[PDB]
Amino acid sequence: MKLEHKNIFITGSSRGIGLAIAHKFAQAGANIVLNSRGAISEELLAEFSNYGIKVVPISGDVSDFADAKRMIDQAIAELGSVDVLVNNAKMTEADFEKVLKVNLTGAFNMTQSVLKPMMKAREGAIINMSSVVGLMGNIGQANYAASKAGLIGFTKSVAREVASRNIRVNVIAPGMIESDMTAILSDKIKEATLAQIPMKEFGQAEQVADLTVFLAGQDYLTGQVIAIDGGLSM
Amino acid sequence: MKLEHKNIFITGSSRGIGLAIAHKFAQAGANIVLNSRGAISEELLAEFSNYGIKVVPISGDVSDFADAKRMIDQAIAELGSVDVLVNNAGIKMTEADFEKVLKVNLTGAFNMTQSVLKPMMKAREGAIINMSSVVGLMGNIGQANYAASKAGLIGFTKSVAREVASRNIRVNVIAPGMIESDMTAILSDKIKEATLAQIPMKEFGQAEQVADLTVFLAGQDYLTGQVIAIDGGLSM
Amino acid sequence: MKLEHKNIFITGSSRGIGLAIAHKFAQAGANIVLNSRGAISEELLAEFSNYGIKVVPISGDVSDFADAKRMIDQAIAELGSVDVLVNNAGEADFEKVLKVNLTGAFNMTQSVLKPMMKAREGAIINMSSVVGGQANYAASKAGLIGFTKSVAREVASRNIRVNVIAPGMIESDMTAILSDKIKEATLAQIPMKEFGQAEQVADLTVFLAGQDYLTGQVIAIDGGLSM
Amino acid sequence: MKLEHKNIFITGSSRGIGLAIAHKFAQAGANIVLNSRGAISEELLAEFSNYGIKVVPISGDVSDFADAKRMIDQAIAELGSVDVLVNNAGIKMTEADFEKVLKVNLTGAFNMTQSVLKPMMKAREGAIINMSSVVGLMGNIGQANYAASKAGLIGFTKSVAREVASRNIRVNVIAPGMIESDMTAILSDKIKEATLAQIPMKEFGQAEQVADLTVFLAGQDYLTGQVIAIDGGLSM
């Protein structure tokens, strides 16, 4: 009931967890922006034409400051507003570092872009999300932890500045999620991976979606970091 | 859906936020244990009659280890299991009554947790939610004692969560802020505008919002060891 | 020597970990209180008489608040003061011992704080019990950790350091005499593939007692067991 | 003595905390590698000639993996082995390259750790001590970058500790707080008093406390994967 007819911008929502988040927001009656760095296909656009909600495809590069502002502006012109922004996010360590920086920059830019309209409406929610945890070497673990800390400090800073304007700003930290590849991995490497999760199991994408939609509709909750990772980041 | 027919032991649930928590869980279809240091009235039980669940009163002293064990067993007997424990214990007063209420929250959280962990670890399932005490009007000495007790409840919760994760038990802390109470409508505007000025979001919480978070956490698998303030940014 | 003539009250110091801690403190030149539920044997006192320190025996029940205060008062009466408190924690029997140990740490900590707070200094070192399941083991170790953080917060502004040591599996008589296939399966569970030694716990306890500006820490000495 | 004749490689030990650490290791009878980006002055080597230990100057760039590898090989060839690696860091001017010294120090821990792990794993013995930088007075962007690089150093340390525990190698991080230094008298009474009031023990730390903790960890067996804050309770 709290989310019906609200307008949700979900970055990276053509695949994976972002798509699960978008299905869950749609099941709650909210209007949906589907967003990808690539194109949104008519396939995907049709999965969402059974909920009786407005669905809008908006592609672009969140990591380009002006293009992030363009994407927020398009959503406002097509839906009327953005009530909720969900900032959902290689092989060498150097390329892995670059990917983390791109996703962090994208979260920064989209957050900066919606602040002005949300602050006018005295209304809105921003949910920043660290990336799903994969297998990483020592240096990848370090780079992962550094960029996650960066996202948390930024998000807490923004939470403090916009509280008096009734904008709620929170971070969700997923852990290791099952995928179709999990079935394919060796029982050896699963066992050494599970060993590092206190709850000794992998997460599911739908758990992240449930938490995301719950936070979106939950007044009076701001500045929080909520890990949903079976204890991984304890 | 995910809480329907689950069994919820809610301590200190005869009034206030505890009682609001009990109502949300009943609205989710969970059976509930209403608990108080003293007797539970027939008119309080009457409030839950249209929910189509089981409601059990168990009164006792959560801060007495023997009676904490007694109350958990009695809840298992009458309901079948304890799937969720919500520790919300403790109820003008001076600083000494304030320390005592803080120590009751901790002791009761400790004892009720230790008791319920015996069946939950054998069943390999369960959720425990520790509630810090609602934040009221506090001076110098008061905030110091509050901060130390909260550090204790958080440290306790994170440590327990570490210890029991391998047996599939989730343990989290909720930290309510300044919550609107039946009292609040009769406070004076000077004291109200002066405490609102301390809250980043410039408003008071609702008991129902604390209840919503409590019920959500209880059903949310794979979330453990978290501290979630619901306080309009007071603790930021 | 940061510890010569400091006054160390060491609960449960007649055997095992507590005895090893008492020896390390005595080796650093500190005065020590040897404590146990029963009487301190004459032998034990004599095993400490050539360190050149004051050795004070004080028997009693830590899990009884009035006796806890009697014991601290007695130690303050016999030594200068109590500069360092070490709260050492060695079926339904298992539950009663954990309860005595956790209550003991609470009672002795409360009794020793007023003198330390007035002095602007002190150190309290809590000990969780060694590993090797129970609800009670989990809750009690967590209880001690939560109490330690609460007290560290409470007393930091008076320059009093409060820390917990969490030992892992320690070799003992009990370890040494069991199946060599159970030890194999047991050591396999420890990332450093070996058992700890009481003397390692003792070195850590002495270091924290003497180390300024370190408080509120939970330090596992467990071969990575809890990483 | 547990450190007598052990071979200690201390990065950034020509001045500040790193130098203090070197002196504490020499007082424990350990052989020392003094290291800096520039060349080690003969006057600094003279401070150590009196200890009856062996003292070896090795300069280079820790943030260059090839030169990191070579520095380690040089130390093995002049001392026999590296038993303990201390990845030391630390610092008036800009925000532009506060980030630069953080990243250089951080990647330095990366390369030196990666380089010494081969001979320690073969030797089946060893210790690695990483150290976050001293907490100083920082703008908001400073604190943001400080928190990120510290989080990165901790994740690196925990990951390596897991990797090498089975080959008897101990890996830990020290997290200093605010160290009283030359920037302490200059600061105004409003500034010290307000800063001191944010530290729970209400006082500034000393470099010697960090050096003492470093020496203790180097010699303490069976202790690995720990993050040890010596910061007056700042991060409790």
TrEMBL record, chain C:
Pfam families: adh_short. Gene3D superfamilies: NAD(P)-binding Rossmann-like Domain. It catalyses: a (3R)-hydroxyacyl-[ACP] + NADP(+) = a 3-oxoacyl-[ACP] + NADPH + H(+). The keyword Oxidoreductase applies. Pathway: Lipid metabolism; fatty acid biosynthesis. Its EC number is 1.1.1.100. InterPro entries: 3oxo_ACP_reduc (IPR011284), KR_dom (IPR057326), NAD(P)-bd_dom_sf (IPR036291), Sc_DH/Rdtase_CS (IPR020904), SDR (IPR050259), SDR_fam (IPR002347). Residues 6-173 form the Ketoreductase domain. It is an enzyme of class 1 (oxidoreductase). The active site is at residue 137. GO terms for biological process: fatty acid biosynthetic process. GO terms for molecular function: 3-oxoacyl-[acyl-carrier-protein] reductase (NADPH) activity; NAD binding. NADP(+) binds at residues 12-15, 88, 137-141, 170. PROSITE patterns: ADH_SHORT. SUPFAM superfamilies: NAD(P)-binding Rossmann-fold domains. Homotetramer. Catalyzes the NADPH-dependent reduction of beta-ketoacyl-ACP substrates to beta-hydroxyacyl-ACP products, the first reductive step in the elongation cycle of fatty acid biosynthesis. Belongs to the short-chain dehydrogenases/reductases (SDR) family. This is 3-oxoacyl-[acyl-carrier-protein] reductase. It comes from Streptococcus pneumoniae.
